[PDB]
Amino acid sequence: KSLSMQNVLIVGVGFMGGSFAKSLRRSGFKGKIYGYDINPESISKAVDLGIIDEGTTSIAKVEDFSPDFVMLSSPVRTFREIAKKLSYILSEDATVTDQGSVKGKLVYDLENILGKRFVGGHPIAGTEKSGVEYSLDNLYEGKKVILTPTKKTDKKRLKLVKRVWEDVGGVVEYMSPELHDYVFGVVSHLPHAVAFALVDTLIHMSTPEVDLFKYPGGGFKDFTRIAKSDPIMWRDIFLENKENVMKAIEGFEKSLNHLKELIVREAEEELVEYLKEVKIKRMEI
Amino acid sequence: LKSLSMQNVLIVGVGFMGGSFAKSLRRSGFKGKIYGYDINPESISKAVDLGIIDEGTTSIAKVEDFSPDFVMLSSPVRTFREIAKKLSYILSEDATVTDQGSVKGKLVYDLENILGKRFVGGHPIAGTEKSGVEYSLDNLYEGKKVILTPTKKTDKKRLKLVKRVWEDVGGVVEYMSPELHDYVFGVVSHLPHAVAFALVDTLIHMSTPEVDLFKYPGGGFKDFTRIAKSDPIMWRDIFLENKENVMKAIEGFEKSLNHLKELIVREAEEELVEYLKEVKI
Ligand SMILES: NC(=O)C1=CN([C@@H]2O[C@H](COP(=O)(O)OP(=O)(O)OC[C@H]3O[C@@H](n4cnc5c(N)ncnc54)[C@H](O)[C@@H]3O)[C@@H](O)[C@H]2O)C=CC1
Ligand SMILES: NC(=O)C1=CN([C@@H]2O[C@H](COP(=O)(O)OP(=O)(O)OC[C@H]3O[C@@H](n4cnc5c(N)ncnc54)[C@H](O)[C@@H]3O)[C@@H](O)[C@H]2O)C=CC1
Ligand SMILES: O=C(O)C(=O)Cc1ccc(O)cc1
């Protein structure tokens, strides 16, 4: 068939950018796969592992790569400024998309920056990890990938990006940018927030003689986990999606306060009921 | 040969933990009798069918026929008192009673007051959210901490016996006072359970006619809330029996949550990053 893609640019050649790179080449993409990063060593590791053909830490060099498909894979807050530079560098017919964990306002701003080139996406792909050395060539298989079109998005580009994620094995679905940021503020951002705060709880509730981290086997262990998420990624998510993050935190307090009220009142059947309902809902997934 | 020191074992509450104890004791090479007491006849018959207990009963009177010299309390924590009262007459003066319950505290003193010199307080930090004797495992305690909570009142020969039995099944024994235990496990165990249950409850009431938030897990919801599937009866007993510590643990947590909230509302680039770098120890 056809060559709807010649040179792709990976912006942010880390764990997620590298896995997209890897997955792409392994789906049969024959074109040039390029890297842009602020960290030269990110570029260096990537080249040495085969993950990219050539890169640079100068944004302007990127023009010599003539890229027609850009995957933004650096922390979300770097996107606007990178986009502003790319809007002069990139052809009118290049396609730009992303893997950032928040959409919402950012998608509208990137459309305004890159015009019709932009399509928002977010793969709901787990395994935590950081850095290109960990990137995987089968990361997106089976996972949902959310694209956030608006009435402004170019349908043919939306079609391209959707298909690219199918080639790497993602199962694609559409959501408004605003719905995305409510949903994931609740189902993703909130659990990380409370995990972070739990770990903080054991810090300040320890005494000098009694380290509480010595006893993880009673429920704490699982929280130990994506509490080891990247602080930069999470600071970035928490602020960029601040309003939904806050509303999600408010609802959790509502549930936590209900459970508290029951324990205080020393209820019992009510308490048992409440716990059976959440067990049931949690089991259904 | 202190096969003499333990001949007839009674498992009270033949569920996940009581059956894991039965199973590990047998596998450790115990040749004595293992009996079961439970209000659910199905717990008893499933345990018999699976070779977990030799026989058992749903009638507390009948346990006197079993002549138990060692009793492992393994039913929900708020059942121990009434059960123990019946046991204090059925059991020989030289019988030892111990438990696996997740709360200690007052309950330890109460059980000493009901059972006299017979009782030793214990809590294995082991197992999962599973419930039911069908999920019981013969290696549940290998390399896991077991906390015993002896007091000035504890029979020292019974503490040593209980201690060794936990060791025979792979456990690593340490001691805590009943009050320290309940503080420690109020925050590292009972707290994280409350918070997981309350996490799932949140997805329920933030769902809407537009959206079932349960359709999107594995942005981190799934892994953090496995323990939200734990047993409601077991957890109800825990939260109520350990209420004073649990409420303190939740206050402390809300202090941490509040501090994170302040850093976000005001967008403190730097305090925030350093706060989240807290998880890196
Ligand atoms: N961690 C996860 O499971 C998921 C992450 N994401 C998104 O993927 C993105 C990246 O995450 P990871 O690859 O895990 O991070 P990472 O920390 O492995 O890689 C980030 C890369 O971006 C580079 N970079 C940072 N600032 C930059 C800038 N201003 N300009 C150019 N390059 C820059 C870093 O040098 C590094 O090479 C984030 O937007 C995140 O929200 C999305 C879904 C899941
Ligand atoms: N789930 C876990 O990982 C751990 C639980 N524990 C403690 O172990 C004890 C048992 O927990 P699981 O084995 O998971 O619960 P389970 O629900 O698997 O088993 C409880 C068994 O107790 C029986 N039972 C209930 N009320 C009773 C009564 N009044 N008299 C006699 N039998 C009764 C039930 O029919 C059931 O067969 C609880 O005190 C719990 O706090 C301790 C450490 C870990
Ligand atoms: O990982 C889990 O499910 C646990 O939290 C296991 C657990 C539950 C209750 C306890 O008293 C001790 C250990």
Side-chain angles (χ1 to χ4, degrees), chain A residues 233-246:
Chain A
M233 176 190 297
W234 280 98
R235 190 275 311 279
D236 263 36
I237 292 157
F238 292 148
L239 306 194
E240 187 69 35
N241 191 213
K242 158 169 78 169
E243 194 37 90
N244 284 295
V245 167
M246 292 318 273

Side-chain angles (χ1 to χ4, degrees), chain A residues 244-255:
Chain A
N244 284 295
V245 167
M246 292 318 273
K247 295 209 200 177
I249 291 177
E250 168 163 327
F252 166 83
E253 271 160 3
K254 170 146 188 188
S255 298

Side-chain angles (χ1 to χ4, degrees), chain A residues 14-16 37-38 42 73-75 77-78 99 101 123 125-126 130-131 233:
Chain A
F15 166 69
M16 295 293 299
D37 206 286
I38 47 165
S42 277
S73 321
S74 53
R77 58 170 207 208
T78 67
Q99 304 182 76
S101 308
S130 258
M233 176 190 297

Side-chain angles (χ1 to χ4, degrees), chain B residues 192-210:
Chain B
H193 282 77
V195 140
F197 290 123
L199 211 155
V200 174
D201 190 70
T202 308
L203 270 65
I204 312 201
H205 71 63
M206 312 211 300
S207 287
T208 227
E210 206 185 21

Side-chain angles (χ1 to χ4, degrees), chain A residues 217-219, chain B residues 102 123-129 189 193 226-227 230 235:
Chain B
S102 301
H123 175 193
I125 317 300
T128 58
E129 5 65 71
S189 173
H193 282 77
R226 177 188 45 89
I227 68 188
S230 305
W235 281 93

